[PDB]
Amino acid sequence: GFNLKVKDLNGSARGLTQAFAIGELKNQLSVGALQLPLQFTRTFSASMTSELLWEVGKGNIDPVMYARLFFQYAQAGGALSVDELVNQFTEYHQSTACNPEIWRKLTAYITGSSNRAIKADAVGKVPPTAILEQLRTLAPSEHELFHHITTDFVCHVLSPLGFILPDAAYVYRVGRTATYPNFYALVDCVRASDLRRMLTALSSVDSKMLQATFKAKGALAPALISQHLANAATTAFERSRGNFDANAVVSSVLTILGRLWSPSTPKELDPSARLRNTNGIDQLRSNLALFIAYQDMVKQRGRAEVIFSDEELSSTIIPWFIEAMSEVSPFKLRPINETTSYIGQTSAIDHMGQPSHVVVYEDWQFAKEITAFTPVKLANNSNQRFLDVEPGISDRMSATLAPIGNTFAVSAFVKNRTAVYEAVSQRGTVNSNGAEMTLGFPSVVERDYALDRDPMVAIAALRTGIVDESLEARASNDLKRSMFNYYAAVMHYAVAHNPEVVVSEHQGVAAEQGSLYLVWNVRTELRIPVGYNAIEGGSIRTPEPLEAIAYNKPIQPSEVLQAKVLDLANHTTSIHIWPWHEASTEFAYEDAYSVTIRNKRYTAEVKEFELLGLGQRRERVRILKPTVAHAIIQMWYSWFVEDDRTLAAARRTSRDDAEKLAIDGRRMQNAVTLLRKIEMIGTTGIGASAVHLAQSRIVDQMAGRGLIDDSSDLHVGINRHRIRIWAGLAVLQMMGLLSRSEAEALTKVLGDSNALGMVVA
Amino acid sequence: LAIDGRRMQNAVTLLRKIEMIGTTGIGASAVHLAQSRIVDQMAGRGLIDDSSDLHVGINRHRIRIWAGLAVLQMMGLLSRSEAEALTKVLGDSNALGMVVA
Amino acid sequence: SVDSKMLQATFKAKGALAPALISQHLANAATTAFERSRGNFDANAVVSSVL
Numbered sequence: 001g002f003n004l005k006v007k008d009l010n011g012s013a014r015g016l017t018q019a020f021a022i023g024e025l026k027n028q029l030s031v032g033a034l035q036l037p038l039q040f041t042r043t044f045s046a047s048m049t050s051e052l053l054w055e056v057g058k059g060n061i062d063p064v065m066y067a068r069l070f071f072q073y074a075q076a077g078g079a080l081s082v083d084e085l086v087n088q089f090t091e092y093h094q095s096t097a098c099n100p101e102i103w104r105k106l107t108a109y110i111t112g113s114s115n116r117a118i119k120a121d122a123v124g125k126v127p128p129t130a131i132l133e134q135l136r137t138l139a140p141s142e143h144e145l146f147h148h149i150t151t152d153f154v155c156h157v158l159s160p161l162g163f164i165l166p167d168a169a170y171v172y173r174v175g176r177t178a179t180y181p182n183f184y185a186l187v188d189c190v191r192a193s194d195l196r197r198m199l200t201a202l203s204s205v206d207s208k209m210l211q212a213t214f215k216a217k218g219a220l221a222p223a224l225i226s227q228h229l230a231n232a233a234t235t236a237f238e239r240s241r242g243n244f245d246a247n248a249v250v251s252s253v254l255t256i257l258g259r260l261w262s263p264s265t266p267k268e269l270d271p272s273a274r275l276r277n278t279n280g281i282d283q284l285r286s287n288l289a290l291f292i293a294y295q296d297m298v299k300q301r302g303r304a305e306v307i308f309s310d311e312e313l314s315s316t317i318i319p320w321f322i323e324a325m326s327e328v329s330p331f332k333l334r335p336i337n338e339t340t341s342y343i344g345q346t347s348a349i350d351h352m353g354q355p356s357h358v359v360v361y362e363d364w365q366f367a368k369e370i371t372a373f374t375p376v377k378l379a380n381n382s383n384q385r386f387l388d389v390e391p392g393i394s395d396r397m398s399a400t401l402a403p404i405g406n407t408f409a410v411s412a413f414v415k416n417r418t419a420v421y422e423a424v425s426q427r428g429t430v431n432s433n434g435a436e437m438t439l440g441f442p443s444v445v446e447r448d449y450a451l452d453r454d455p456m457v458a459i460a461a462l463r464t465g466i467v468d469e470s471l472e473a474r475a476s477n478d479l480k481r482s483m484f485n486y487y488a489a490v491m492h493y494a495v496a497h498n499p500e501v502v503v504s505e506h507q508g509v510a511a512e513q514g515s516l517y518l519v520w521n522v523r524t525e526l527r528i529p530v531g532y533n534a535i536e537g538g539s540i541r542t543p544e545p546l547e548a549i550a551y552n553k554p555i556q557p558s559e560v561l562q563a564k565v566l567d568l569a570n571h572t573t574s575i576h577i578w579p580w581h582e583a584s585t586e587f588a589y590e591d592a593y594s595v596t597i598r599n600k601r602y603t604a605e606v607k608e609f610e611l612l613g614l615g616q617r618r619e620r621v622r623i624l625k626p627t628v629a630h631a632i633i634q635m636w637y638s639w640f641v642e643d644d645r646t647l648a649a650a651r652r653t654s655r656d657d658a659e660k661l662a663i664d665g666r667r668m669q670n671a672v673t674l675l676r677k678i679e680m681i682g683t684t685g686i687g688a689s690a691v692h693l694a695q696s697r698i699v700d701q702m703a704g705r706g707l708i709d710d711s712s713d714l715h716v717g718i719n720r721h722r723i724r725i726w727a728g729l730a731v732l733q734m735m736g737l738l739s740r741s742e743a744e745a746l747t748k749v750l751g752d753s754n755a756l757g758m759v760v761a
Numbered sequence: 762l763a764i765d766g767r768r769m770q771n772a773v774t775l776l777r778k779i780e781m782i783g784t785t786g787i788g789a790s791a792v793h794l795a796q797s798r799i800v801d802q803m804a805g806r807g808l809i810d811d812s813s814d815l816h817v818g819i820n821r822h823r824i825r826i827w828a829g830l831a832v833l834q835m836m837g838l839l840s841r842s843e844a845e846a847l848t849k850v851l852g853d854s855n856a857l858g859m860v861v862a
Numbered sequence: 863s864v865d866s867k868m869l870q871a872t873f874k875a876k877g878a879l880a881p882a883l884i885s886q887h888l889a890n891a892a893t894t895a896f897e898r899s900r901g902n903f904d905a906n907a908v909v910s911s912v913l
């Protein structure tokens with residue numbers, strides 16, 4: 001992770017700063033005091049990591065299955081934020097009804113009409129999912145959704161009789177998104193709750209209509225209700241004129257929450273005796289999480305003061321109901337004391353004792369497996385595909401990687417970096433002014449790396465306080481979400497850690513007195529200068545959260561540290577396809593190593609390349625492959641990078657050799673550790689396979705010539721360690737555990753210290 | 762439109778219950794036969810990394826229809842006209858999937 | 863409801879569903895309930911207003 005510093009986050013992790021959500025302009029410490037309660041449901045965001053796959057057009061229907069994807073599609077990064085999705089679909093819904101044709105056409109595709117209405121239609125209802133593609137002329141639908149979705153009703157099950165089929169199912173999927181929410185996250189999510197309101201009656205009409213309609217007879221003739229059948233939805237289309245401004249509700253609600261908790265009695269702030277109870281947000285008010293949301297939204301908006309409410313009804317009303325209470329999300333409104341469990345602690349002590357190291361870590365234990373990729377392109381020649389994965393790369397590589405999961409028993413990495421303990425004097429007297437306070441058990445890494453953000457850039461921005469901000473709306477707001485959610489995810493592990501807090505002003509600019517922050521008492525430690533809080537008040541009593549948790553004590557991990565991941569094995573034969581893509585894709589990418597002895601530069605040329613035990617290429621396949629697994633690793637790499645940056649700067653800064661001693665130690669704790677890591681990972685076994693195979697091509701390189709032919713002096717004090725890190729490269733790339741790229745980062749550490757074997761072998 | 766799906770229905774129906782007649786066994790032996798032979802003709806041919814086969818696809822279907830004459834071969838009835846005349850109709854008829862299976 | 867609610871929901875189990883369990887919430891709900899009273903009405907208020 002990243003490290004700071006007791007007085008600081010502020011130079012190198014401003015996102016940490018609440019004031020930024022508060023709007024403190026990067027510097028001044030929460031001054032005000034002058035604070036009231038805070039409290040808990042502990043409170044809104046994601047449970048955790050949920051993975052699932054998706055059935056579409058099954059013909060049983062109902063709102064719940066999609067809106068999720070519709071919720072998800074965003075998550076899917078459908079196009080842009082859900083409300084698009086809802087809007088873009090609703091928009092079809094809007095080139096609405098003047099197409100009674102589809103009814104007319106459904107009626108007309110009621111075969112070929114009721115024109116000979118009679119008791120007749122009997123078959124063919126899987127190709128009118130495929131059919132309601134035929135409906136594409138009336139409504140355009142690259143955004144398959146309705147093009148897929150429009151199907152559902154028409155083939156509700158009605159004709160429940162006559163027809164007939166279908167008797168089959170589709171795929172949806174969804175890999176985890178966020179464990180925590182953000183307010184524009186909220187606005188969409190509400191837009192999802194609205195598509196949700198939308199369906200039922202829509203579910204109901206067809207469902208309703210068909211049972212009521214067919215008194216019959218067996219078939220109740222025809223020219224029938226389906227003519228209404230579809231009629232209801234457009235009717236439904238109009239049925240949306242529009243429920244609320246979800247944006248309106250959400251912003252009004254954020255404003256109300258600020259108020260719910262405000263410091264300033266003045267009335268941008270009149271939280272009622274009349275309505276403060278009244279169910280509603282009253283259970284919600286305690287909630288910190290909304291409070292985090294409030295802090296950010298407000299900075300973003302301040303509060304959007306339209307007072308949609310009156311202080312009675314409404315403020316009774318559009319705040320009557322809320323999205324989270326409405327379930328198109330995979331967010332859930334949080335349990336109330338657990339928070340998001342998953343931490344052991346230790347903290348610094350040269351015997352004095354105090355700390356500026358941390359010991360909070362990853363609570364991780366990732367997948368035991370991974371995925372082939374072949375989109376079974378064949379059936380319908382489009383997205384309709386099946387990867388059709390079979391024993392191939394996937395099983396051998398997995399087992400072999402499956403040490404791979406091993407390197408990163410994440411608690412163990414924190415173990416190493418929490419193994420530190422003594423330098424900087426002892427036992428007793430290490431500590432020198434600056435700190436380190438450090439973090440994270442998988443969700444933040446998981447949220448990004450999957451999302452191609454490569455956290456790292458957002459992270460540098462994070463630290464430097466003010467964000468990097470070149471970024472694309474895709475790019476910029478990847479940054480945004482990751483920075484918001486990351487901080488919040490920590491926060492209700494920060495909020496959770498000590499209930500005492502206090503909603504703080506800031507003051508700051510006016511801007512509208514909204515801006516507000518939180519402080520708490522934690523009692524225990526002797527007075528080792530920890531910011532300005534030691535505590536001076538019995539207890540930590542610092543609004544800065546890192547500040548708050550940090551002056552506290554060790555524990556253990558409640559959490560699973562499960563990597564989760566999705567088996568579709570039932571599907572894995574079942575389907576058919578949802579909106580899948582990123583696989584990763586084609587199975588691997590080539591990487592070789594060349595070694596010198598007797599001085600003959602070679603290059604065996606193994607890739608990347610099967611390695612695996614068959615030839616070759618292979619083909620075909622790849623593995624959008626459990627982020628975590630990439631995730632856990634991303635974290636180890638991050639560590640390397642951080643320490644190195646620090647060192648360089650200080651060594652130039654710190655002339656003293658003793659200072660240099662300290663420096664080698666940090667750079668080369670990275671060095672050493674990375675080196676040890678390399679050795680191990682490479683003696684993973686396959687890689688060891690690379691060692692025999694790549695050697696041999698290098699044997700050919702070792703044995704190309706006659707003179708070279710006496711095969712190796714290539715084996716030296718260095719070699720075994722050399723093609724050992726051939727083994728390192730083999731662990732290193734296209735396992736897919738790591739993308740590549742980084743390789744030079746590891747190089748950077750190896751270079752930094754002779755490292756050598758250092759021994760072995 | 763109506764006739765055409767309905768043509769549609771007729772076709773779907775045929776392909777599937779052709780499945781049923783055609784596979785159902787003893788036919789299935791055909792169908793495997795379609796596999797054993799083709800498969801080792803695949804292995805026999807040499808390079809199978811791109812061998813699909815069977816999941817799906819008419820090729821999914823094509824098995825079903827090869828079973829389809831086959832059962833309807835060793836009947837004393839048909840003749841072999843039926844197939845290919847069948848085959849032709851059924852084939853474009855549609856077959857449109859999905860639905861096997 | 864909490865205890866009543868919690869216990870039926872809590873113990874998927876197993877026979878006992880191990881422990882360290884919900885009763886940790888078990889009681890949690892009441893204080894939560896404690897807070898749950900911030901206060902419904904002024905009954906005095908209601909009553910006098912009503913008179």
